[PDB]
Amino acid sequence: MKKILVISDNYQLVSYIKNLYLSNEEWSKELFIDYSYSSINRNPQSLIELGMTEIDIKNKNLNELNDYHLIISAHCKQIFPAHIVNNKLCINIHPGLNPYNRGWFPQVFSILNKKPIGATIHKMDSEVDHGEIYCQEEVSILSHETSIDIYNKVIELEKKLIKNNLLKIINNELQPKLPSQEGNYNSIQDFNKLCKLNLEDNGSLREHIDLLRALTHGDFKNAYFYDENNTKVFVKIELSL
Amino acid sequence: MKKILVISDNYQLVSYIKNLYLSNEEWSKELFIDYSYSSINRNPQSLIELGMTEIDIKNKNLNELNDYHLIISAHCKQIFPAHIVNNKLCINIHPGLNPYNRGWFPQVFSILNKKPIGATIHKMDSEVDHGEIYCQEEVSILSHETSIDIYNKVIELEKKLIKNNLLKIINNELQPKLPSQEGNYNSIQDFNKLCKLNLEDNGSLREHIDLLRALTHGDFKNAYFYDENNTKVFVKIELSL
Numbered sequence: 001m002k003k004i005l006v007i008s009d010n011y012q013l014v015s016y017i018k019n020l021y022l023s024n025e026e027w028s029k030e031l032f033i034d035y036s037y038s039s040i041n042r043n044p045q046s047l048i049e050l051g052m053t054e055i056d057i058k059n060k061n062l063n064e065l066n067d068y069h070l071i072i073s074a075h076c077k078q079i080f081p082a083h084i085v086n087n088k089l090c091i092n093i094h095p096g097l098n099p100y101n102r103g104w105f106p107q108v109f110s111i112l113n114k115k116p117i118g119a120t121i122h123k124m125d126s127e128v129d130h131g132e133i134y135c136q137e138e139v140s141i142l143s144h145e146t147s148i149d150i151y152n153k154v155i156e157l158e159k160k161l162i163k164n165n166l167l168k169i170i171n172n173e174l175q176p177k178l179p180s181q182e183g184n185y186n187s188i189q190d191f192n193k194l195c196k197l198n199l200e201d202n203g204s205l206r207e208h209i210d211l212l213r214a215l216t217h218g219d220f221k222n223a224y225f226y227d228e229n230n231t232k233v234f235v236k237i238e239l240s241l
Numbered sequence: 242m243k244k245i246l247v248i249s250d251n252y253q254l255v256s257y258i259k260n261l262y263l264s265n266e267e268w269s270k271e272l273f274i275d276y277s278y279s280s281i282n283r284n285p286q287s288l289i290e291l292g293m294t295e296i297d298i299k300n301k302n303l304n305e306l307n308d309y310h311l312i313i314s315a316h317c318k319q320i321f322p323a324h325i326v327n328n329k330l331c332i333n334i335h336p337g338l339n340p341y342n343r344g345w346f347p348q349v350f351s352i353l354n355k356k357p358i359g360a361t362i363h364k365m366d367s368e369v370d371h372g373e374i375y376c377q378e379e380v381s382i383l384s385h386e387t388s389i390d391i392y393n394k395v396i397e398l399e400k401k402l403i404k405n406n407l408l409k410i411i412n413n414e415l416q417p418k419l420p421s422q423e424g425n426y427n428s429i430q431d432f433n434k435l436c437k438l439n440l441e442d443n444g445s446l447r448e449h450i451d452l453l454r455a456l457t458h459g460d461f462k463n464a465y466f467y468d469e470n471n472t473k474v475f476v477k478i479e480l481s482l
């Protein structure tokens with residue numbers, strides 16, 4: 001048997017992994033799996049409801065990780081320090097098509113800059129969303145779709161990748177390969193610049209609809225303007241066939 | 242006593258007028274009120290439920306209307322023929338500030354063109370939304386508001402104008418005044434042109450957000466574009482404090 005550590009702050013992916021273990025005898029006869037959410041998760045209830053434990057991977061002593069054959073990050077909210085990724089096999093499930101729009105909310109950037117979007121399972125190195133790729137697949141962006149629409153496709157794709165590839169990766173059956181290039185990276189500040197709308201901006205209606213749809217994601221409060229009295233107004237769009 | 246005919250295709254206004262009658266001794270003691278919806282109303286069920294009768298005022302024979310002291314239009318879907326307005330006292334309750342943005346959906350156009358918006362009770366002549374004005378009041382348009390937001394304010398003000406003035410008009414206690422200018426009439430085709438978005442249109446973000454809020458009104462399917470594959474996509478905006 002092997003011990004496996006999954007660090008996730010996404011209910012859907014951890015639930016999915018849990019369900020694969022309970023329904024697949026190869027998993028349950030071979031693997032022990034601990035699951036933890038990150039200490040910086042501000043709302044972890046739904047994860048605590050599944051019996052997960054908190055972990056702070058930035059302060060976790062290397063020593064306490066010796067048993068683990070490997071570590072999986074499924075939408076972990078923390079950057080793994082260099083010392084962790086360089087001394088333990090760490091594998092990340094990322095909601096973007098590396099190396100395009102690495103970093104924050106890839107589908108928001110892809111709606112705007114037209115680079116590929118998708119899902120990627122990859123080895124972690126000390127950089128973000130950077131290490132060698134085990135599998136990935138693209139998804140499309142249609143004219144009517146917002147962030148949340150594409151994000152939902154990506155999650156479904158991540159589930160597919162996990163189902164078809166995760167056990168092979170754990171069993172050293174799958175061999176990864178360098179990304180074709182360095183790619184591009186988008187930060188939280190970049191997302192924040194986009195959210196601060198400029199009512200004076202000159203552009204096509206197309207460009208403005210695309211900005212609003214990239215920034216439309218459920219109840220998240222993203223895009224805003226200030227009006228002539230300095231009242232803050234958030235803005236989202238709805239597109240329907 | 243006086244016989245009054247009310248032609249309305251608007252559940253709220255007709256219901257309000259019926260409520261004032263039921264609640265105000267000055268009304269029940271002085272008035273008999275007949276109520277009809279237009280023969281062209283495609284979904285009159287809610288009005289039929291009030292026991293209202295169908296009328297086609299474009300075909301109605303004038304001799305059949307002799308008993309009426311006056312006729313009130315309250316969001317009537319038909320243009321009254323010259324013969325009717327020139328031989329019966331006809332009064333319209335209009336959800337715009339005449340003479341600005343007369344005709345269709347005044348508040349849509351005011352969001353776009355910044356002309357005043359409001360409600361008006363006026364005498365009907367053979368032109369639309371054009372006769373002498375008994376009373377009217379402006380409402381304002383706030384940065385976060387859509388068509389439906391402003392429309393709701395108009396309807397409320399329509400109630401206040403009725404409550405305060407409609408009996409005075411009926412009893413010849415309030416004399417109307419010419420509109421300040423000829424003004425501008427928007428047609429249905431004008432509305433439909435605005436709905437056909439041009440994705441290549443160049444404008445400020447302001448401009449584009451204003452066009453989309455002018456066209457956002459609950460579940461009506463108004464603004465659309467065609468994508469690359471000629472799929473029709475409807476667009477609404479949400480603005481929120």
Ligand SMILES: Cc1cn([C@H]2C[C@H](O)[C@@H](COP(=O)(O)OP(=O)(O)O[C@H]3O[C@H](C)[C@@H](N)[C@H](O)[C@H]3O)O2)c(=O)[nH]c1=O
Pocket residue numbers: 009010074075076077095103104105106147151215216217220221222
């Ligand atoms: C927080 C936030 C999120 N979103 C949208 C865009 C995101 O793609 C989507 C999901 O975000 P989420 O953070 O709630 O859920 P996850 O996609 O599970 O994100 C998690 O793993 C990611 C790979 C890390 N970068 C995140 O920090 C971490 O929270 O929601 C917004 O549109 N605005 C926001 O403020």
Ligand SMILES: Cc1cn([C@H]2C[C@H](O)[C@@H](COP(=O)(O)OP(=O)(O)O[C@H]3O[C@H](C)[C@@H](N)[C@H](O)[C@H]3O)O2)c(=O)[nH]c1=O
Pocket residue numbers: 250251315316317318336344345346347388392456457458461462463
């Ligand atoms: C039909 C339609 C309406 N709307 C919005 C804008 C309108 O101000 C609002 C309500 O219009 P309505 O037709 O449902 O309801 P009312 O405001 O009662 O309008 C009625 O009296 C008016 C004086 C006439 N011009 C209309 O034909 C007649 O239906 O809803 C749209 O945004 N799109 C639409 O296609």
Ligand SMILES: Nc1nc2c(c(=O)[nH]1)N[C@H](CNc1ccc(C(=O)N[C@@H](CCC(=O)O)C(=O)O)cc1)CN2
Pocket residue numbers: 073076077078079080081082085092103123124125126127128129130131187188189
């Ligand atoms: N090692 C390493 N750690 C990783 C990944 C990796 O492939 N390599 N992949 C996943 C990436 N998830 C993220 C990426 C960035 C942040 C993040 O929170 N960035 C902060 C600050 C971090 C910093 O720069 O120090 C910011 O943008 O301000 C959080 C989770 C999880 N951790």
Ligand SMILES: Nc1nc2c(c(=O)[nH]1)N[C@H](CNc1ccc(C(=O)N[C@@H](CCC(=O)O)C(=O)O)cc1)CN2
Pocket residue numbers: 314317318319320321322323326333344345364365366367368369370371372427428429430
């Ligand atoms: N007499 C006359 N009739 C009226 C009003 C008026 O103050 N004067 N006031 C109300 C106006 N209601 C309308 C206005 C326009 C239409 C309409 O159907 N317009 C068409 C036709 C336009 C036209 O022929 O002028 C269009 O936009 O293309 C229907 C109900 C009720 N009827």
Ligand SMILES: [Cl-]
Pocket residue numbers: 421422423
């Ligand atoms: Cl004039």
